[PDB]
């Protein structure tokens, strides 16, 4: 039943998932270490600014949502302190890699990286009341906002500033976040949408219309389907049903779309005219493409008790929970092939850090709570 | 045990049985709220009694801030502050007592306690809402109670300052919390707390000597428990280990020195001495007094692993639901008769309203998911 559901979640967060990350990622030195193997252990050294920031994110939006828990904001602490350290350039914009000890690895600039530290300094300062670390945020903030602006747009980029937004939001005017939100529904519902197939396409010309090439023809199941939560719980805030009703029909769209009928699970990637991908991993089935289904499956059947998306909903389950969690060592697997036998045997690596996992079993557990 | 039944069942009742009546019974259309409540929750009389309209605000507030900013409850609260903001203060600015349902004032000497729960009302709202107006309605009760042959002084004023101060956090600087809280722990172990007999004075001498008077000998069971689990609360912040043992430890010495082992319940109470109170109500069941034993149970057992907090819990669990407990109509009688028989038909009055059992129950919640 739904009360178990909870249960599950909220036990498999705060008994199997946050320690996992305590006992296995804390640097010593500062910072977290990501590339961990199946049993924890440290493969790599390496500090993934992006990760280094959604987990300082998590640990402080759970005191924040949750207990402001001595352990956590400590957790927390060190990663932001660390990254304040080492994390910028003079002229204070974001690397995207650091040495275990700190030291720049050189590449392209990207926007993205300020964005992650914004949202994690914001939820950091919020928990723990130090000015020092929302003086980083707004740097951050004010960084995203002088830089961010075949042409084509992608969906990511939407996706990302009502993200940035709104883990903002307790430094911004009531207004600012408000203009925001209500602008990502209308380009992600109006542009990014395809009124021709009910399917989110990931790239778009700026007007919207379809570009027949590599980018323009790709879909992405999981990211979709996690805008499609995002758009619900934005929606949510003005009891605006017909939006979340919308984001529904769209979630249940790309699932019928993108499972495999052969072997169980979603498609990493597919091609919108069925044409040959480029990506050589379109057909592997990965961590949070599964898990951010199961949170926009569970918050579809709690805002509007569509008994199409509970039934989704336990499809989505049974698959992800028997091939992705280990619970013997703790947390779940990330990489999985086709056929859902493991690919990479890693708890984290470069993109795989403390975010997608602890986040959607919160959302769930939160989402089971009210349904039950 | 099954500790997870436990915290599901306090938070259901909080959820589906507690917030409910209020919302559903006591939202006064011309502001603020009735807490003059039947059994059935039909009002029976107008009369805003001022301590209570704010701690209501303050629940709906509080529970904003610590579980899930709902509107329906920022909305409570609210229309609630507002009432209170234009009608609870004097041209001094010093709170009232009470007020016609309007908010014509009742006379009757001022107290500073009126100021003090205003002071924890409006931080909490102006926390949950942003709003400054609210602000600067908590600044100014705070700063009122700042600027203010046998002496004696009583329990509630350090519980009641170091309450003030706790749910001013947010406006505060750290060390003043800090140093209230410290002087808190000092004030209520060393002066109020007899070493010799392990039991809490409502009164004695400012150097904490005893006094032979009918205030000097009075033991009120349930205030010296609702002291003991706030002072748990303060000695955990830092982890001290003894001082949350301490009183602990005097917990089980009240319970033990203040159960009826006729009837069961403790006693409203009682006399130091063994000479007979000044209270003819001192034998009497209230609801509030065998609410915070649970709270500081369920405390004590979460926070030491005491195995002699449960075995006390079991008992004063099956006492205060089998006789407190309304589920036919919502919400807890306040007033039984020593023999636990329902002696006054309500749910709320002048001192009963939208404070200890919602609290209560929150608290019992916490307590049951963490030692779960």
Same mark, same amino acid.
């Given at each position: 039943?739904?009360?178990?559901?909870?249960?599950?979640?909220?036990?498999?967060?705060?008994?199997?998932?946050?320690?996992?990350?305590?006992?296995?990622?804390?640097?010593?030195?500062?910072?977290?270490?990501?590339?961990?193997?199946?049993?924890?252990?440290?493969?790599?050294?390496?500090?993934?600014?992006?990760?280094?920031?959604?987990?300082?994110?998590?640990?402080?939006?759970?005191?924040?949502?949750?207990?402001?828990?001595?352990?956590?904001?400590?957790?927390?602490?060190?990663?932001?302190?660390?990254?304040?350290?080492?994390?910028?350039?003079?002229?204070?914009?974001?690397?995207?890699?650091?040495?275990?000890?700190?030291?720049?690895?050189?590449?392209?600039?990207?926007?993205?990286?300020?964005?992650?530290?914004?949202?994690?300094?914001?939820?950091?300062?919020?928990?723990?009341?130090?000015?020092?670390?929302?003086?980083?945020?707004?740097?951050?903030?004010?960084?995203?906002?002088?830089?961010?602006?075949?042409?084509?747009?992608?969906?990511?980029?939407?996706?990302?500033?009502?993200?940035?937004? $709104? @883990?903002?939001?307790?430094? %911004?005017?009531?207004?600012? &976040? !408000?203009?925001?939100? #209500?602008?990502?529904?209308?380009?992600?519902?109006?542009?990014?949408?395809?009124?021709?197939?009910?399917?989110?396409?990931?790239?778009?010309?700026?007007?919207?219309?379809?570009?027949?090439?590599?980018?323009?023809?790709?879909?992405?199941?999981?990211?979709?389907?996690?805008?499609?939560?995002?758009?619900?719980?934005?929606?949510?805030?003005?009891?605006?049903?017909?939006?979340?009703?919308?984001?529904?029909?769209?979630?249940?769209?790309?699932?019928?779309?993108?499972?495999?009928?052969?072997?169980?699970?979603?498609?990493?990637?597919?091609?919108?005219?069925?044409?040959?991908?480029?990506? $050589? @991993?379109?057909?592997?089935? %990965?961590?949070?493409?599964? &898990? !951010?289904?199961?949170? #926009?499956?569970?918050?579809?059947?709690?805002?509007?008790?569509?008994?199409?998306?509970?039934?989704?909903?336990?499809?989505?389950?049974?698959?992800?929970?028997?091939?992705?969690?280990?619970?013997?060592?703790?947390?779940?697997?990330?990489?999985?092939?086709?056929?859902?036998?493991?690919?990479?045997?890693?708890?984290?690596?470069?993109?795989?850090?403390?975010?997608?996992?602890?986040?959607?079993?919160?959302?769930?557990?939160?989402?089971?709570?009210?349904?039950?």
């Amino acid at each position: 039943n739904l009360q178990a559901l909870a249960q599950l979640y909220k036990n498999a967060l705060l008994n199997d998932v946050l320690p996992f990350w305590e006992n296995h990622s804390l640097d010593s030195e500062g910072g977290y270490f990501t590339c961990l193997d199946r049993q924890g252990k440290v493969y790599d050294t390496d500090k993934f600014i992006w990760l280094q920031n959604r987990q300082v994110w998590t640990f402080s939006m759970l005191c924040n949502q949750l207990e402001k828990r001595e352990n956590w904001l400590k957790i927390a602490r060190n990663g932001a302190k660390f990254l304040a350290q080492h994390g910028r350039d003079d002229e204070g914009n974001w690397y995207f890699a650091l040495t275990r000890g700190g030291e720049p690895l050189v590449q392209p600039y990207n926007i993205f990286s300020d964005c992650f530290a914004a949202m994690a300094f914001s939820q950091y300062a919020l928990a723990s009341g130090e000015e020092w670390a929302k003086d980083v945020a707004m740097q951050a903030y004010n960084n995203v906002l002088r830089r961010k602006d075949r042409p084509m747009k992608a969906l990511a980029v939407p996706m990302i500033l009502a993200n940035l937004t $709104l @883990e903002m939001e307790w430094l %911004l005017p009531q207004e600012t &976040l !408000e203009n925001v939100l #209500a602008a990502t529904v209308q380009e992600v519902m109006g542009d990014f949408l395809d009124q021709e197939q009910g399917l989110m396409y990931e790239n778009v010309a700026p007007d919207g219309s379809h570009i027949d090439c590599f980018e323009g023809r790709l879909i992405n199941p999981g990211h979709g389907i996690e805008a499609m939560w995002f758009i619900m719980d934005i929606a949510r805030r003005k009891n605006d049903s017909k939006t979340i009703n919308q984001a529904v029909d769209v979630v249940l769209n790309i699932l019928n779309f993108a499972w495999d009928n052969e072997y169980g699970g979603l498609y990493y990637f597919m091609d919108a005219a069925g044409h040959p991908p480029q990506q $050589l @991993e379109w057909d592997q089935k %990965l961590w949070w493409v599964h &898990l !951010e289904s199961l949170v #926009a499956l569970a918050m579809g059947y709690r805002l509007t008790g569509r008994d199409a998306c509970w039934a989704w909903y336990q499809k989505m389950h049974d698959y992800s929970w028997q091939h992705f969690a280990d619970p013997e060592y703790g947390e779940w697997f990330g990489y999985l092939n086709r056929r859902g036998e493991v690919l990479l045997n890693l708890k984290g690596g470069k993109w795989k850090g403390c975010f997608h996992v602890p986040r959607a079993m919160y959302l769930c557990w939160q989402q089971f709570e009210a349904l039950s």
